[PDB]
Amino acid sequence: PKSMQCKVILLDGSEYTCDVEKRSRGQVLFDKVCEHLNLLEKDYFGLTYRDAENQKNWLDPAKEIKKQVRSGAWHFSFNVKFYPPDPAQLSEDITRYYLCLQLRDDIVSGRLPCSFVTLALLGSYTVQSELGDYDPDECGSDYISEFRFAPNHTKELEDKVIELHKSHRGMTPAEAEMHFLENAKKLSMYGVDLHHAKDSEGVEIMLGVCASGLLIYRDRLRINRFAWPKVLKISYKRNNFYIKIRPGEFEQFESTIGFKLPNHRAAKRLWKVCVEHHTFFRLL
Numbered sequence: 681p682k683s684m685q686c687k688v689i690l691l692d693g694s695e696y697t698c699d700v701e702k703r704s705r706g707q708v709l710f711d712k713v714c715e716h717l718n719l720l721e722k723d724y725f726g727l728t729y730r731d732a733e734n735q736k737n738w739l740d741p742a743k744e745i746k747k748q749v750r751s752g753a754w755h756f757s758f759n760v761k762f763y764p765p766d767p768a769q770l771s772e773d774i775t776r777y778y779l780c781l782q783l784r785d786d787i788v789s790g791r792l793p794c795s796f797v798t799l800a801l802l803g804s805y806t807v808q809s810e811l812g813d814y815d816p817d818e819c820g821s822d823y824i825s826e827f828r829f830a831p832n833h834t835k836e837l838e839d840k841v842i843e844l845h846k847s848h849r850g851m852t853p854a855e856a857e858m859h860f861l862e863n864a865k866k867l868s869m870y871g872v873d874l875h876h877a878k879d880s881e882g883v884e885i886m887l888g889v890c891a892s893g894l895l896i897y898r899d900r901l902r903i904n905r906f907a908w909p910k911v912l913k914i915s916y917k918r919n920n921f922y923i924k925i926r927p928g929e930f931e932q933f934e935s936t937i938g939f940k941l942p943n944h945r946a947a948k949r950l951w952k953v954c955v956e957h958h959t960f961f962r963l964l
């Protein structure tokens with residue numbers, strides 16, 4: 681029985697290596713990574729791989745790994761797939777911990793924009809969780825944390841983390857992680873998967889996929905929002921993505937909104953993430 685070596689980047693930046701039978705479905709590898717991580721609330725998470733175009737794709741747990749990675753390396757990342765709107769409702773602290781790790785990477789990477797003060801506040805909870813109570817012995821007037829808090833670090837930001845860290849004395853890791861999530865969950869781009877697209881007129885937009893629905897970022901004035909219940913049908917064809925917007929009260933007909941994606945693979949990827957978000961966040 682021939683086995684393929686899999687390498688998984690974990691959310692703490694370390695690497696997990698295992699083997700699976702070469703005809704394995706994604707679920708087999710995902711089950712091994714989750715066991716390694718001691719993670720039971722697995723439904724929020726998944727594995728990503730880079731396709732031949734270097735795009736991030738979700739590994740489909742129901743399909744053979746080899747039919748997804750195709751000609752590429754069996755190299756994956758462990759990621760949050762479905763960002764819970766209310767992390768306080770997750771049953772385990774360790775779930776909230778991985779969610780924190782993911783969001784810290786979302787912030788550092790610039791995928792999750794954040795004000796100065798929220799960067800410092802989120803940083804201060806991470807430091808409280810990881811080092812415990814503020815200690816002046818470690819931090820002089822010139823202190824710079826090993827911790828990555830933001831796309832761009834300034835001394836002002838490091839100083840503000842320390843000032844907020846002072847206020848969290850006696851806070852337990854689970855308690856600091858819950859506070860981290862209470863603040864992070866409110867950010868306008870929390871759990872928004874962004875896709876480059878063009879509207880029916882060829883104007884460049886972004887499409888956001890999240891728990892609530894589909895967001896159209898047309899310009900800074902007017903953001904269109906389609907709550908999942910208002911969406912009956914999601915389709916793709918060639919380079920196009922279509923949504924069928926439920927008829928309003930006393931309207932005779934469904935309406936159709938069409939978007940152009942860079943290529944057919946980009947259209948299919950957006951279609952699958954929408955269908956997956958719609959199925960997941962319906963059961964709420």
Ligand SMILES: CN1CCN(C(=O)Nc2ccccc2)CC1
Pocket residue numbers: 868890892893894895905906907908
């Ligand atoms: C101030 N808002 C609060 C709600 N939330 C959304 O945008 N939700 C949404 C609603 C309908 C369709 C798509 C998304 C985050 C920021």
